[PDB]
Amino acid sequence: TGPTQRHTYYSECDEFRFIAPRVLDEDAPPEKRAGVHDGHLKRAPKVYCGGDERDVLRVGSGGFWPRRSRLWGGVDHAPAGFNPTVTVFHVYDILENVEHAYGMRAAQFHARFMDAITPTGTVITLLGLTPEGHRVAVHVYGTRQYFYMNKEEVDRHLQCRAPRDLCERMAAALRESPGASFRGISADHFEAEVVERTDVYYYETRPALFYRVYVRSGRVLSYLCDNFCPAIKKYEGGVDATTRFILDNPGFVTFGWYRLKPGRNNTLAQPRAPMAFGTSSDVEFNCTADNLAIEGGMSDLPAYKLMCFDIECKAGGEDELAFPVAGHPEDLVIQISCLLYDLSTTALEHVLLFSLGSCDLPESHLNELAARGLPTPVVLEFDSEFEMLLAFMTLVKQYGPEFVTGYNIINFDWPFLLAKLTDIYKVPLDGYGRMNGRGVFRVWDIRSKIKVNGMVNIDMYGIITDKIKLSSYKLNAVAEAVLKDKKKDLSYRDIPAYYAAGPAQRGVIGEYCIQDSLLVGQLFFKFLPHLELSAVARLAGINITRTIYDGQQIRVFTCLLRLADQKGFILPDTRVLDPTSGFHVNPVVVFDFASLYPSIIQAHNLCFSTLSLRADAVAHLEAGKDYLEIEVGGRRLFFVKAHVRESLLSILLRDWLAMRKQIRSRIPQSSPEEAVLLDKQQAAIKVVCNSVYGFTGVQHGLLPCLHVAATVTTIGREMLLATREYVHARWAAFEQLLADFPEAADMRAPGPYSMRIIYGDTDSIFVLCRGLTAAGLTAVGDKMASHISRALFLPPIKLECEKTFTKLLLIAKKKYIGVIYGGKMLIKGVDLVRKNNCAFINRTSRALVDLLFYDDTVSGAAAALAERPAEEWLARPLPEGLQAFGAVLVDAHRRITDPERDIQDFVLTAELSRHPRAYTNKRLAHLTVYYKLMARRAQVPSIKDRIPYVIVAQTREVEETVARLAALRKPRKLLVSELAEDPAYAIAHGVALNTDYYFSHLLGAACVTFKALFGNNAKITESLLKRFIPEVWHPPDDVAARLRTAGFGAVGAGATAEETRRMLHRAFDTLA
Amino acid sequence: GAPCQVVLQGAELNGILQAFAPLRTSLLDSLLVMGDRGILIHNTIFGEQVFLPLEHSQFSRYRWRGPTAAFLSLVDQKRSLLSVFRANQYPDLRRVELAITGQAPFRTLVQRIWTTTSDGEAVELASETLMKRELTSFVVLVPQGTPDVQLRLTRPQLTKVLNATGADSATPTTFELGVNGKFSVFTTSTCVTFAAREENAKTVYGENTHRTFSVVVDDCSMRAVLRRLQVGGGTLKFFLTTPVPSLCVTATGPNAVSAVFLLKPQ
DNA sequence: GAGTTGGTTGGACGGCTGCGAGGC
DNA sequence: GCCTCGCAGCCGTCCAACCAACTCAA
Ligand SMILES: [Ca+2]
Ligand SMILES: [Ca+2]
Hints:
GO biological process, one term (chain A): bidirectional double-stranded viral DNA replication
Distance between the termini of chain B: 52 Å
Structural class of chain A: alpha+beta
InterPro entries (chain A): DNA-dir_DNA_pol_B, DNA-dir_DNA_pol_B_CS, DNA-dir_DNA_pol_B_exonuc, DNA-dir_DNA_pol_B_multi_dom, DNA/RNA_pol_sf, DNA_pol_B_thumb, DNA_pol_palm_dom_sf, DNA_pol_type-B
Structural class of chain B: mainly beta
Catalytic activity (chain A): DNA(n) + a 2'-deoxyribonucleoside 5'-triphosphate = DNA(n+1) + diphosphate; Endonucleolytic cleavage to 5'-phosphomonoester
Number of helices of chain A: 33
Number of helices of chain B: 3
Helix content of chain B: 10-25%
Number of domains of chain B: 2
Keywords (chain A): DNA replication, DNA-binding, DNA-directed DNA polymerase, Endonuclease, Host nucleus, Hydrolase, Multifunctional enzyme, Nuclease, Nucleotidyltransferase, Transferase, Viral DNA replication
Strand order of the largest sheet of chain B: 6-2-3-4-22-21-20-14-18-17-16-15-19
Largest sheet of chain B: 13 strands, mixed
Strand content of chain A: 15-25%
Oligomer: heterodimer
Largest sheet of chain A: 7 strands, mixed
Shape of chain A: globular
Bound molecules: calcium ion
Number of strands of chain B: 22
CATH class of the largest domain in chain B: Alpha Beta
EC number (chain A): 2.7.7.7, 3.1.26.4
Number of strands of chain A: 41
């Protein structure tokens, strides 16, 4: 007999495409070790381990990798009499499938389940784990999708008079479908009833009668929602069966603990027989939703398994330094590291290395892992790529890790593996997830996304780019930045040399692959990304896989859908704020609105359902008292206030914020473990609250309302201007401030008092507090912010004093540098360190900024520049104090010309992308150094890697060696690409660095910041910065010699004052 | 006021304007050297040395203290201190000041400009003001001593000598003064001759006619230089008692500009 | 796969050199 | 006959528009 539904993964195989590098034939002659073998071999796929050999697809006692599978290929491998009792189980994922009573007729299901799938029906499968670690699938029957259509519009269009008419109209539209993909549909595939509902859009909208239509399949629904009566608006046709299951059963969650219990007529869940299992579980059940309850109290995650994996690839074409492409047969996967952790204890349980060809891990690496108390690696050796890939997919099916991680696994590792399995080897993937066949196992490009049924893929690259701001997101850079580990590396360039050298050298590739996976495991258990993702899944009412790969909209949509249903609604299917740039040495207080856009929505009761576009809709209400009128995008809009009708968006936000405040109240009195869970929960509520405004503003999104989004920004803009006008009018004089806040008497500094808004952006304003000290301004700022909030705005709008700057440089909109009263420097919208610059310019640029902020002499002098137009500083001496700033530029200029220097401080570098002949433009600096190395120096030039270089001053030797005709196989004034030189050569011959190149780059770096001191004029800024350097003038050496032999006398340096003077007297007498 | 100050207005300003009028753009990039004697302006044109001395006597006021100062004429690599004197730069120009302030070697020159307005009144043209710090160190090599021979040539005569000069290093030019004041200039083709006498189209006047000589120039830029400078008649001054002999040509029109050419072989 | 930078092409502004020929 | 005045052509300098090149994922 075997399984009721066929298993589509490979449980047997006796022929396959054998692809392997010829270099593994270590007895073959040197001519015949290039490229790959590629042919068909009639053999069972083998694996070798520690001198033993097995078939990859054999299940039995002596396996080389761990298993958590009961069935294999329709044979039950559980011990005799294995029959666990299941009461509580945890759900981590929910599948949605169609079952047919005819397909399931051999399975011994009770009649109540067969009824739910006769002739067809949707089954919701809860995937999970018991407290004893048994894998469970609970199949829930009886959930139906449904949509609405307006009864009067349907009755007037289709001439229906009873619900059974509409059932036949829909059956007809499906019977008559192109290609007859819906053959055999009947009115019994439908149910229709008449209900009263309101469209969620507009306040004037009256309740109406609708047909609520139930359907047995999403395939049918997604045809009816666009092919049937396109003129008739439909409601909630896009809602999946999982969402209906979650929303129609109060309290149910997509991630969490459940209990099996007796249903309405004391009915129980039925355990499936093994040959009726749909998944790779230990036990499976049939039940209805009344057999389920949420288990209160239980909150600990069970022993789920995490696989952390990484692939290593080798290009096999005419250049092994080309990046590998999966569609090329010769570009092989050569190794896969695979680490298996317990997700509940965080312990590493297994270290597996899959290797194409023999592989001896270094004793050094084995000793290091043993000293760290980690499992001894198991090396699995394969003769070909197919046997290795099949064994890895066999491990994925048999061990069935619920969570999978790695670095760039969505963007590179899975796409490469699955392209090999699909395109090269023709393996069907639909049985390799949790389901035994016909499941989703799919990759697609946007960068990429993945869905694998019953497997949660979490790539750490996405987690870390979102959490940490870094120059580079290579795993090396992340390991140094986050973990503080100085790890080793193997460039793809070295890989093909190591691979060919033998098993010990393939062992070094293995060490590197394992160490990569160990670092990614450490990143995972630091950030715990499954805990924040599961917290969002629980809050939003969607599965964890959709939480990761679907956007922000579905999270708000599902919460709105729950609330809208409870309220009877249905959802239809689809310059004075600009900165005057400059430097302030009087204190600046930053006022910031807490959660501006959510608090506007709440304070003003904005919603789909409180909006009107029409004056007659609000003619029975009183203006101002019962509704807001507001001009938005030229249109007059009306929003009724909460006592007339409460906004759904406002109710969502209020209930979430109350929940967040409640959670954060409990954190200080909770265990170190509880505090982690509560922190993840409070963070989930913040991300969902912040997405509400965006949800309304997506044109062509789920449930768009551009009127609500535009109203939120319109109110936000007016609130900044109101805050500004209030501050300027209320505290124009120190006596007015002092009358509101009596400690201001202690704050009063020398000089004139004022308060002025100097900058504002979206939800923040900066107030310059001239004539006050910084020390009290944060405390007075809290009281200012509280006073403003109570004077101008409705709760829950709240202005807060964020910070006090002692010194600030406004550069542009969203660009500034400042120092906070607590000594910390803060930078926004500006990078002071450039990736392409030498260390000399990065370090000196930062020294000029540090000096502007940390010498009060220079700060005071810089603040004086604002008292005059930028052009006027061209024609008068700069302020007293900037001479210390000029001295840094003079020292920097000197430090290029100094002969004792470390040339390494000035090194630029670039990598050859391809062999030098293939370049379009020959002048790229690093190409000049390639040709200078290979010709002028006659050294071996570096092969397709990073070339270091420096820029040299134009001289003889340089002008001569620019005749590099060896490049085939302007001269008066050389270009920067010609003046490039090797650092080792430059040291050895004491060559002069190019003062114009490095110093003009230093001024280019400086001006982008200091533009703000001189009215954003880059030309004035650069001109004034040049003037600090000491100018000198001399005739050329040859000219000086000739003129001395012509009897000319020397005026200037190298002579005493009276010699110079008397020589000028001679000069005027001769030139008479 | 400043310790060092120089002023031009009225008749003295018209004198300096007339001196720069034929010089056009030829001096805008240059070295200004200043002392108790006046301002010496130095440049090189086609590689040859060029000088314009402005004596303290030619200014409305001239006051100096402390060491010699030197300034490059270009400010911020764009505007020139000497722009104000070009023939049509500021048509209403009325008065000019240089004020030099500070302590050596870090003194700053500020140049200020005034123009004529309603009822002839002076207004400071403040946008045009220039500021330049002195060179921290400099060396410049200048002519000195008395020339061995001097000969004065008119607007014609000098243009004949320039045309008689060889076009290139391929054909060197000989300048000669023979017996009975027979001045001559010649090359492989062209030749001109004049009758020099002590201080009529053939007649030439000079300071030391008895000193016969014969000298060569063999990379001769001087037809390019002296026409670039628009020299309308001038004095040929010969330095002969020197390892490398030299010819200095001093203009005798409104401009007192001089260019110095190195000779061969003596 | 998107931001920065060193090099190439192009047209315009400004000033000089050489030719032709008007006024004296 | 010859001094000097204007036009036509060449050159240098300059701003602008554009291009090919890194960098990265193994
Ligand atoms: Ca990877
Ligand atoms: Ca890898």
